[PDB]
Amino acid sequence: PKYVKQNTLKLAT
Amino acid sequence: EEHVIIQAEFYLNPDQSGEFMFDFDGDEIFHVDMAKKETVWRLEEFGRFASFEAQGALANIAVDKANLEIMTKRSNYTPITNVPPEVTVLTNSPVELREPNVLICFIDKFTPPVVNVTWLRNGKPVTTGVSETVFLPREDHLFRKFHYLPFLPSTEDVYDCRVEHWGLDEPLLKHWEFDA
Amino acid sequence: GDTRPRFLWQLKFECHFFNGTERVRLLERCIYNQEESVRFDSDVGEYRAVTELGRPDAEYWNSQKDLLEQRRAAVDTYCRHNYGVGESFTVQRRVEPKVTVYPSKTQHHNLLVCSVSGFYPGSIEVRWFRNGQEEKAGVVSTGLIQNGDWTFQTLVMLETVPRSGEVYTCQVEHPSVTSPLTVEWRA
Amino acid sequence: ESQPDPMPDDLHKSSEFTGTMGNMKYLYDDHYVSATKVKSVDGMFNWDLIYNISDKKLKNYDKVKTELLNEDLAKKYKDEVVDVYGSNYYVNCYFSSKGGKTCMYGGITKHEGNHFDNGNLQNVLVRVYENKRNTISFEVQTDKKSVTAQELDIKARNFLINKKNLYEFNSSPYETGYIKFIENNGNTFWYDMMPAPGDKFDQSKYLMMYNDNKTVDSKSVKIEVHLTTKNG
Numbered sequence: 001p002k003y004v005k006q007n008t009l010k011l012a013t
Numbered sequence: 014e015e016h017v018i019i020q021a022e023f024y025l026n027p028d029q030s031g032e033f034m035f036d037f038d039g040d041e042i043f044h045v046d047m048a049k050k051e052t053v054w055r056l057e058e059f060g061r062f063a064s065f066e067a068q069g070a071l072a073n074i075a076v077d078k079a080n081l082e083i084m085t086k087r088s089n090y091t092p093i094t095n096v097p098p099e100v101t102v103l104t105n106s107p108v109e110l111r112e113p114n115v116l117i118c119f120i121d122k123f124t125p126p127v128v129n130v131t132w133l134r135n136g137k138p139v140t141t142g143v144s145e146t147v148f149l150p151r152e153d154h155l156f157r158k159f160h161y162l163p164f165l166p167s168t169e170d171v172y173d174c175r176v177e178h179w180g181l182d183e184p185l186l187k188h189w190e191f192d193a
Numbered sequence: 194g195d196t197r198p199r200f201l202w203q204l205k206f207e208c209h210f211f212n213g214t215e216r217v218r219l220l221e222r223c224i225y226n227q228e229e230s231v232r233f234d235s236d237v238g239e240y241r242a243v244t245e246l247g248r249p250d251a252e253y254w255n256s257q258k259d260l261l262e263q264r265r266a267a268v269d270t271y272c273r274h275n276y277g278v279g280e281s282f283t284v285q286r287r288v289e290p291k292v293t294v295y296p297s298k299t300q301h302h303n304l305l306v307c308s309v310s311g312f313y314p315g316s317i318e319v320r321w322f323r324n325g326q327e328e329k330a331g332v333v334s335t336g337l338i339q340n341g342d343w344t345f346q347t348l349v350m351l352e353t354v355p356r357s358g359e360v361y362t363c364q365v366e367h368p369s370v371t372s373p374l375t376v377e378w379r380a
Numbered sequence: 381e382s383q384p385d386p387m388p389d390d391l392h393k394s395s396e397f398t399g400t401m402g403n404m405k406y407l408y409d410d411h412y413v414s415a416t417k418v419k420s421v422d423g424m425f426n427w428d429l430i431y432n433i434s435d436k437k438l439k440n441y442d443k444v445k446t447e448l449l450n451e452d453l454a455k456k457y458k459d460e461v462v463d464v465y466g467s468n469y470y471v472n473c474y475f476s477s478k479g480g481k482t483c484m485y486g487g488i489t490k491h492e493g494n495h496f497d498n499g500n501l502q503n504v505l506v507r508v509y510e511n512k513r514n515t516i517s518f519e520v521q522t523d524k525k526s527v528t529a530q531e532l533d534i535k536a537r538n539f540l541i542n543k544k545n546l547y548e549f550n551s552s553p554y555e556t557g558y559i560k561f562i563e564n565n566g567n568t569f570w571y572d573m574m575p576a577p578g579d580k581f582d583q584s585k586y587l588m589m590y591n592d593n594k595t596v597d598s599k600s601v602k603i604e605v606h607l608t609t610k611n612g
Contacts, residue, residue, distance in 0.1 A: 001055055001062065001064070001277070001278040001279070002063065002064050002065065002066075002278065003035060003042075003043075003063055003064070003065040003275055003278050003279070004270070004271060004275060004278075005065075005069060005070065005073065005187060006206040006221070006267065006271055007021060007072070007076075008022070008073040008076040008077055008080070008204055008259070009071060009076070009250075009254060010079060010080065011079075011080045011083045011084065011249070012083075012114045012249035012250045012252070012253035012254075013083060013249050013250055014209055014210070014211055015210050015211055015212065015213070016209075016210040016276070016283075016284060017207055017208065017209050017210070018207075018208040018210075018272070018275055018276060019205055019206065019207045019208070020205070020206040020207075021203070021204070021205050022203070022204045022205075023201060023202060023203040023204070024201075025199060025200070025201050025202075025204050026199060026200040026201075027197055027199065027200075027424055028199065028426065029423055029424070029426045030425075030426065035275075037279070037283045038283075038314070038315070039339050040339070040340075040341070040343045041201065042279060042283065047425055048425070049428065049587075050472075050584070050585070055342075055343065056343060058282065059279070059282060062279070062281060062282055063278050063279055068311055068472045068584070071472070072472075072474045072476045073204070074424075074474070075424065075474040075475050075476050076476075077204060077295075078202075078424060078475075078476040079256070079476040080202055080204075081201070081202035081225075082476070082478060084200075084202060084225045084230070084246065085200040087246060087249075087274070088225060088226075088246060090198075090200070092198030092199060092200065092226070093199045093200060093201050093226040093227065094226065095226065096227070103338070103346075105311070105340065106291065106308075106310045106311060106346070107293065107295075107308045107310065117340055117341065119341075119586060122366075123200045124201070124226075124227055125197075125201050126201075146341055148234055149225075149341075149377070150203075150205060153222050153227075154228075154229070155227070155229050156201060157341075159340070159341035159342075161342075167207075193298055
C-alpha cells in the first residue's frame with residue numbers, strides 16, 4: 001500500500 | 014466526525030527549514046527527512062505495512078519556498094509574531110520507585126517552529142535514551158512537539174525540561190521530581 | 194543573538210472522514226504566518242480567499258479547470274486512497290488501557306484517583322460508581338492526554354466520604370475491549 | 381583511523397543490478413559542473429548552496445544547487461569565493477531560487493591561493509586493477525592544490541569509460557569495482573563504483589556520497605581503482 005501526496009500549487013505572480 | 018488525515022508541510026525563512034509529514038487523528042504517521050530524503054515512520058512497524066515515495070516531498074517543499082517568498086513580499090514583509098510554548102512534563106505511566114518509566118516533555122502552542130530542548134538531571138544535561146518528534150500541526154496553526162527521556166524513578170533525582178524559544182523572555186525550565 | 198525576523202509558510206491538506214469512508218471532505222489550506230490566506234473546501238468546490246492576501250490565488254487557480262477537476266476528485270484519489278492505505282494500523286489500531294485505582298496524595302474526605310494510561314484510540318469512557326450506581330457529582334477529570342507515541346493517558350478523580358463496606362468502582366469503556374474494565378476500591 | 385578496505389560482501393555486484401547501467405555512465409561520461417571564482421547566492425535548505433553557473437555546453441541550466449553533509453559545512457563556504465567541480469543530476473533535483481536548474485553534492489573548494497601560477501596542472505597517479513592485477517596506470521589532472529575527491533573520481537571514471545568501457549548502456553564488463561584514495565598521511569577511503577542492487581538506480585542517492593566535500597592534496601594523493609570480472 002502506498003501513501004500519495006497532494007502537489008503544492010504555485011501562488012499567483 | 015470520525016477521523017482526520019492531514020498532510021502538513023511548511024518552509025521557514027530565514028532558517029531555511031522545512032517539514033513534510035502526515036498525521037492521523039493528531040498522531041504523526043510519518044515525516045520525510047529533508048536531508049537523507051527518506052520516509053521515517055513514527056513507529057517502526059508502519060514501515061512494514063505501507064510506503065511513501067519520500068523523494069517527492071522535496072518537490073512540494075521547493076514550491077513551498079517559492080510560495081513563501083511571494084507571500085513575504087506581498088505582505089510588505091510582515092514578520093511572524095512569536096508565540097511562546099506551553100510546556101508540561103508528565104510521566105508515560107504512573108510512577109513507582111525503581112520501576113522504569115518515561116518522562117514526556119509536552120511543548121505546545123508555539124510558533125515559529127524552531128525550538129531548543131534540553132533534559133536536565135540535577136542541573137546537568139542527560140543524553141542517552143532521549144528522543145524527540147518533529148513539529149506537529151495544530152488547528153490554530155501553531156505547533157506541538159514531544160521530547161522523551163526514559164528513566165529510573167528515585168527519591169533523590171530532580172529533572173528539568175529546558176526549553177528555548179524566541180517568544181520566551183528567558184529559557185524555561187519545567188521542574189519535575191518524584192512526589193508520590 | 195539571532196534577531197532576524199522569520200517568515201513562515203504552511204500548507205495543509207486535511208481529509209475529514211465521517212462514518213468510515215462514507216462521506217469525505219477535503220480541506221486544503223494555505224497559511225502565511227499565523228493566518229490562513231486561501232483554501233479549497235471540497236464542499237464548496239473551488240478556492241475561496243480567506244484574507245485579501247489570498248485573493249490573487251483563489252481567482253488565479255479557479256481559472257484552471259484542469260486543476261479544479263483534480264482537486265474535486267481528490268476526495269477519492271487522495272483522501273479515500275490514503276485512508277485505506279493505513280486503515281489496518283490506524284483506524285483499527287487498538288491498545289488496551291492499563292487501569293489502576295489508588296487514593297490521591299492530597300485530599301474527613303478521601304480523594305480517589307483512577308489512572309488510565311497507554312491506551313489507543315483516544316475515545317474512552319471512564320465513570321465512577323458507588324455500590325453499583327453511577328456517580329455524577331464529585332468527579333474531576335484531567336482530560337484526554339495525547340502522549341505523541343500513539344498512546345493516550347488520563348486521570349479521573351472522585352471525591353468521597355468513605356464508609357466501611359462501601360465499594361467505589363472506576364469503570365472504563367474502550368474500543369480495545371468488548372466488556373468494560375472495572376477496578377474497585379474497597380472502603 | 382582510515383576506512384577499512386572492502387571485502388567482497390561489502391561490494392555492490394553489477395549482476396544484481398537489473399536496471400539500466402547507462403544511468404550510471406551518464407554521471408561520468410564527459411559530464412560535470414565546473415565554475416571558477418564564484419559565491420553562493422541562495423540556499424534551499426541550510427545545508428546547501430545555490431550558484432549561478434551556466435551550462436556553456438548545451439545551455440541546460442544556469443542555477444546549480446549543491447548539498448553538503450551539514451549546516452556547518454554549508455556555512456563555511458556560504459560567503460567564500462570558491463571553485464566548483466562535481467557530477468550533477470536532474471531526476472529529483474528540487475529547489476526554488478531567489479533558466480534551467482541542476483543539482484549536485486559537495487565539489488566546493490576555496491579559490492584563494494589554491495591554484496598554480498601559470499595555468500599549470502597537477503598530475504595525480506591512478507593505477508587500475510582488474511582481478512587484483514594492475515592492467516593500466518595513468519594520471520588525471522587538476523588545477524587545484526587541494527582538490528575534492530569527487531573531481532578526481534569523475535576524471536578517473538570518465539577516462540575508464542572511454543578506454544575500458546567501465547560502463548555501457550546496460551550492464552558492465554566488471555562485476556564489482558571500487559575507487560580507493562591514499563593520502564600522504566596514510567589515510568585511505570573508497571567509493572563503490574557500482575549501483576545498488578535492484579531494477580532502479582537512484583542517481584541522487586548515489587551521488588549523495590560526495591556529501592562530505594572530502595578534499596585531498598593533489599601533489600601527494602594516490603588513487604587505485606580495483607575492478608573485477610564476474611567469473612574471472
